[model samples]
Target chain A: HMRISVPPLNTKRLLPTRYKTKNAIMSILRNGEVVLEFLKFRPTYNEDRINDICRISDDGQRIIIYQPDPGRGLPVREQPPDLQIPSGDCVYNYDNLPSKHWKKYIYGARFVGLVKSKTPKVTYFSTLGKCQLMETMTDFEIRFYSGAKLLKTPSEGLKVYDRNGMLLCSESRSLIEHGNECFTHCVNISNALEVAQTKDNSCFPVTIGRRP
Target chain B: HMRISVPPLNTKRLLPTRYKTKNAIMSILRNGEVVLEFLKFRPTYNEDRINDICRISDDGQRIIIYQPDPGRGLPVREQPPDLQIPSGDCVYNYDNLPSKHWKKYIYGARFVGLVKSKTPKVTYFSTLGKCQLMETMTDFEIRFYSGAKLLKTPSEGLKVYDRNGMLLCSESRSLIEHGNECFTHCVNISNALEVAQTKDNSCFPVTIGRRP
Candidate 1:
């Protein structure tokens, strides 16, 4: 008779689970009330690395993941069936108005991603490594966050978090001054989180900022 | 004793004169009417090569040319006094609406230099190497031109010309597909032509697209 080992059910339940959300809008719920909301955007991916596992739509809006057939793994070329949760929802609203300085430097401007608070009616618009906080829809206050503490108007370092203090996204300080390139890190991290969610079918705790 | 040679007055008059225009706007006159108008935009410049001779404003809206002091060819750093013919006039209208396809690939879009025809009451908006022809203010027809010949509808190769059959600008056939990179060629060419005009104080013939 072979010896058998089993893990505790409580330990399995505590482990973080990952699954794709039907929509890109992710909400952190506390006692059934929405605390924090994330309107995610499609992150850039390495074509060579993901080509074997992912298929991008012709319009470049949708992305789908598929397992390679046994011994017949080939580079993705043909458009695969649309993912049940398509990446189309992860698009930036390019039409959104930009600030004078933004218009001057960035030829065409786009928001990085958006974070919203339901109770306080506050919203944060991500740009590069900084966030423009809009309180009560009109009151504007821009600040940088590191982990959970939000700094008073100061440049250098950035991190995003939920109302409940869960880390949402972050950018490397070294690349913060690189302008458009900084957004790539945020986008890549978002993409990794989404992929993790799609691969597993349970809630994954937003603990780490590194790419999966 | 060396023999002195005399040149004809007509030959001197026929030679093209180059000078900086007060504004980036250039209009071709025919019988005292503005037949063709060009609202130029700043072309990209190579900083390493032009640093000693050029100074760009902090806001990047203005560019000034300065004669390097004798034996003191230091790299450009401090902002020089505004040029009499400042490059501010050569700015793109980033606020201009973009086509669906343009907004897709380009994150932030800006109109290339604009060309207007007063006779046909037409306007041509430059984007990359191609021109989008808007006739009668409403009728739109997009076409590519080679030298003075405009193709009906085709992809590949691009040239821009004034209504009077004079070459205004052009992109090399090889680089037309490079998207934003193609604009650099047009901008460098435009900068060279502008520098030629400012240095020579004469109307130079638009005979070539190569950078000065």
Candidate 2:
């Protein structure tokens, strides 16, 4: 049986190797619940070679790994956010992003990658205002996972650490980039999430991967 | 599209054969939004046979039918209701029990078909303390397919009708009785619902046949 330890909800600590331990976690307070923001492993995807997925715990509690629904393809991706960005604990500032084109992934949106360093850790490369125009920021936490990064795009990798300076998870791509570009607020972060689902393991093998 | 009316939540009503032309509703109080007790159909035992079973609606919008888990069936079927019955308007006499034997269909409970005719406009039947077992009695109307006359056992070729003295739907075999040996509660209504899936057909077909 595979024993498991899930971090508290929304509580994020800087991972090890990124900076020091305190630099690890930047907990986001929402609805008065303390949570450790750990990248969720999407256990389902409609990709070609993967599909029938399931998960189980040590005590034999069977659970389903909900991959992104192929039917809706994540509504936000289809209709990216076309709204204003707010600045707060949930928001991430980018590199050279125009004042008018600042919004990236909206609050409460889900994504996977490493954390960017700061007193309040921000995503190194945020999509800024997801569901909005894409021609705004140079880097943000969310990035396309194609074979190569686009020119003038955000960094491809960012390392995330925990409070104990432990490397928790690493992003193959970057999410923070504040450069100039074309188009206005037209796209959103949800678009990238669809791609993220594809990268997530299709099967958590809950049957065999039961935690002790 | 079988666009049946989507009446406002609480104001939902059905007219007896006599009141089909009447369609007026109002909410007298906020906390209580003119409660409308309705009769919704369900389909169950679906795998029996396509031609043998059917559903009333295929939209799958009806609420789930509750059933016993694997372990909790026997204790309920064998118990007796050593309790009271009902009496007045907005009043149920709990002590008046016909014979408190558990109804065989729903093991968790019994079906004491004991009914009370309180007023010209209302009739009562219940398993609990003459309480509004089936919800607001004034708002509901009953139809006696087999003629308001009562039967105590399960039988074939029985009939059904809606309130307002009109038959909305009918079935063979009695929903409330059987033979000379009365089934305190002969059948749990939920067991009769049988929904079937189809590439064509908006509402599922349903069938009910029982022991004589």
Candidate 3:
């Protein structure tokens, strides 16, 4: 079972069955509405590990994942707290954009919907690790899930755009940095997840970070 | 057995044990000494074959190979008779340099000495074909043998220079023409022939046009 807990906001969403499809870390608010914003699959600049950032608005219906930087970049904890979910269902609008510094670093995104678990007990092992206790699903529990791919469907292989604050990280990271060209389309998480399921190599990594 | 024949002038030096080493199509004249001008192992230009052009001197002691040209390459037939090899052993002389066009072309060369056959005949099938008439030692036969490696003992693969005409013709005809570099010290025929008589795989393409 994939469970999302927002400590500061005092809210928790458990997707006992939802995690079987996608692995996501949710950022919530005190009122229980999850923030809707760009959330990427990447490790923290300093920690060298993956963690989500949640900047939910006063309205409590949105989240904005922090953008990472290169070489001793600002940590996720030190970022400003107040944030507002942009108008409309989309996370970021092109007409009115965020600060230039904040704009490029974060992969813009949005929340689609809160799906419900059809079963009485959405029982499953935790994604953090196996051998954990399987929990009984609350009949009315709101299953938290996230949907978004890398902001750009990259044609070129692994590359980092410093100005864009986007690191198109991948297997070819070094080569891309050295100015080699990789003609691959950006990965589609939905399609990727299906393949994993199809191949019987179903695992958590596929649902979490960009395809390894 | 290798037999060297000089038509108009008349000097025959045979090395029945010779052709066992390198294939060299040599054009020559006679007085007593043979011209050591150009020696290549290729078939034809248009057919991507290897060939050589030899020009022995009037003194019958030295040879000079004609340098080729571009735009209006002079046919081999139009070249002059009675060519005199320049003074020193080295091909080019700065003080009495020939035309610039003539210099880069033609592998400038000379004959050092006829190495003695340390062993029996250097017998093998001809580079032109298999199964041919083999002969015994002949003192009167001017054995014609050619030994010239490409200018560079190539770090790069095969290639040649049309204007330079120093494709080092023989074995590297197709490869050299394909643009490669070979870096090599000139084969001191004095020493190589000894090894050929010592080793097997010896045959002659000296009388033939291209590879068998």
DockQ of each: 0.00, 0.01, 0.00
The lDDT for every candidate, in the order shown, is: 0.25, 0.20, 0.27
> What is the alpha-carbon lDDT of model 1 when measured against the actual structure?
0.25
Q: Which stretches of candidate 2 lie over 4 Å from their true place?
A: A1-138, A141-153, A168-212, B1-3, B7-212
Q: lDDT tens string, model 2, A1-212? A: 32122211121222222111221111222222211211222334332221111221111122212223333323212111222333232332232222332211111111112221221211112133211122223332222322222222245443322223233213322322221221111122222222322221110000100011
lDDT string, candidate 1, B1-212, tens digits = 32112110011112112122332212222211111111122233323221123322222222223333323333323322223553443322223212322221121101111221111111222332242222112222333343323422123344433344443325433323332233333233334333323221221111111111
* Candidate 3 lDDT over residue span B114-155, tens digit each: 222222221211221211111212111111123222222123
**CAPRI-style docking class of model 3 based on DockQ:** incorrect
For candidate 1, write residues A1-212 as lDDT tens digits. Answer: 32112110011112112222332212222111111111122233322221123322222122222333323333332322223553443322223212322221121101111221111121223332232222112222323343233322123344333334443325433323332233333233333333322211211221111110
Give the higher-lDDT candidate: 2 or 3: 3
lDDT of 2 at A160: 28
Distance from true location, Cα of B164 in model 2, Å:
50
TM-score of the second chain in each model? Answer: 0.20, 0.15, 0.22
Which TM-score value belongs to model 3? Answer: 0.15
Q: Compose the digit string of candidate 2's lDDT tens values, residues B1-212.
A: 23222211221111111101011111112222121111222244322111110111112122111222222221211121121332232221112211221111111111111111111211123221111112112222223333343221132333333232333313323423222112211121111111211122111111111111
